[PDB]
Amino acid sequence: MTFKAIINGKTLKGETTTEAVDAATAEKVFKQYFNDNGLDGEWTYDDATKTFTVTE
């Protein structure tokens, strides 16, 4: 499946894509990075445009 991920930060802002079979498969890799930075951000699935919004 073709998906995208957008970050909404005040200091660090970017934009990357995500290509995985399911949402869980792609999440497994996300949870691993969540600790890498140890940030407290909130993820949101925007099915409206098939994009993942991250509002910290």
Side-chain angles (χ1 to χ4, degrees):
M1 274 285 191
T2 305
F3 282 127
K4 192 165 279 172
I6 189 71
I7 309 300
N8 195 259
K10 188 177 272 81
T11 320
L12 43 150
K13 181 270 201 290
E15 57 200 273
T16 189
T17 50
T18 328
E19 275 87 287
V21 187
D22 215 350
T25 308
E27 272 273 274
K28 272 159 171 182
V29 181
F30 274 48
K31 59 170 76 271
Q32 283 188 247
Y33 276 51
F34 174 91
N35 199 40
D36 210 295
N37 283 250
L39 292 169
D40 191 2
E42 293 185 272
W43 266 252
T44 38
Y45 300 77
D46 317 72
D47 206 35
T49 65
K50 287 90 75 168
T51 307
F52 313 128
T53 301
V54 186
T55 320
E56 53 162 71

